[PDB]
């Protein structure tokens, strides 16, 4: 399946993922497509920040869902 | 569009292949037999 990751700036990114993927797996996929260090990444889904070590399904994130990327920087 | 975690008052969503647990509750289950 596939989801969208949206920075605050506006830039959108499409990711191909499995519901089994951990938040770390996803932060890693972003570091690839956008060279950001996963320690700088804070992912947010429907107002909740995604906690490390849990999976997309644990959050009921389904195909075409939208996460926002915030940064610690 | 799925189903909550089989365990007590768990905030997360389970999955059939995890006998209905979220990922970490499932590991907890597995670790206890
Ligand atoms: Zn649980």
Curated annotation (Swiss-Prot), chain A:
Membrane topology designation: Peripheral membrane protein
According to UniProt, the name of this protein is: Ubiquitin
Where does the record place it? Answer: Cytoplasm; Nucleus; Mitochondrion outer membrane
Top-rank taxon: Eukaryota
Post-translational modifications reported in the UniProt record: Phosphorylated at Ser-65 by PINK1 during mitophagy. Phosphorylated ubiquitin specifically binds and activates parkin (PRKN), triggering mitophagy. Phosphorylation does not affect E1-mediated E2 charging of ubiquitin but affects discharging of E2 enzymes to form polyubiquitin chains. It also affects deubiquitination by deubiquitinase enzymes such as USP30.
Q: What does this protein do?
A: Exists either covalently attached to another protein, or free (unanchored). When covalently bound, it is conjugated to target proteins via an isopeptide bond either as a monomer (monoubiquitin), a polymer linked via different Lys residues of the ubiquitin (polyubiquitin chains) or a linear polymer linked via the initiator Met of the ubiquitin (linear polyubiquitin chains).
In this chain's numbering, which residues are marked as the site (Essential for function)?
Answer: 68
Positions bearing Phosphoserine: 65
Outline the extent of the Ubiquitin-like domain. Answer: 1-73
Point out residues bearing the modification (Microbial infection) ADP-ribosylthreonine: 66
Cross-linked residues, Glycyl lysine isopeptide (Lys-Gly) (interchain with G-Cter in ubiquitin): 6, 11, 27, 29, 33, 48, 63
Indicate the span of the full protein covered: 1 to 73 of 229
Mind telling me which residues the site (Interacts with activating enzyme) is annotated on?
A: 54, 72
Curated annotation (Swiss-Prot), chain B:
Identify the stretch(es) annotated as Required for proteasomal degradation of UBE2N and UBE2D3, TRAF6 deubiquitination, and TAX1BP1 interaction with UBE2N. 3-33
Q: Which residue stretches are annotated zinc finger (A20-type)?
A: 1-33
Tell me what effect the entry lists for residue 13 to A.
Answer: Impairs ubiquitination activity. Loss of down-regulation of NF-kappa-B activity
Q: Where does Zn(2+) 4 bind?
A: 5, 10, 22, 25
* Protein name in UniProt: A20p37
What are the top taxonomic ranks of the organism? Eukaryota, Metazoa, Chordata, Craniata, Vertebrata
């Amino acid at each position: 399946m596939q989801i969208f990751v949206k920075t605050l700036t506006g830039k959108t990114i499409t990711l191909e993922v499995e519901p089994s993927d951990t938040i770390e797996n996803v932060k890693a996929k972003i570091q690839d497509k956008e060279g950001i260090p996963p320690d700088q990444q804070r992912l947010i889904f429907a107002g909740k920040q995604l906690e490390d070590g849990r999976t997309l399904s644990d959050y009921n994130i389904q195909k075409e869902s939208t996460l926002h990327l915030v940064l610690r920087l | 569009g799925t189903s909550k975690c089989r365990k007590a008052g768990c905030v997360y969503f389970g999955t059939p292949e995890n006998k209905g647990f979220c990922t970490l509750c499932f590991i907890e289950y597995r670790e206890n037999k």
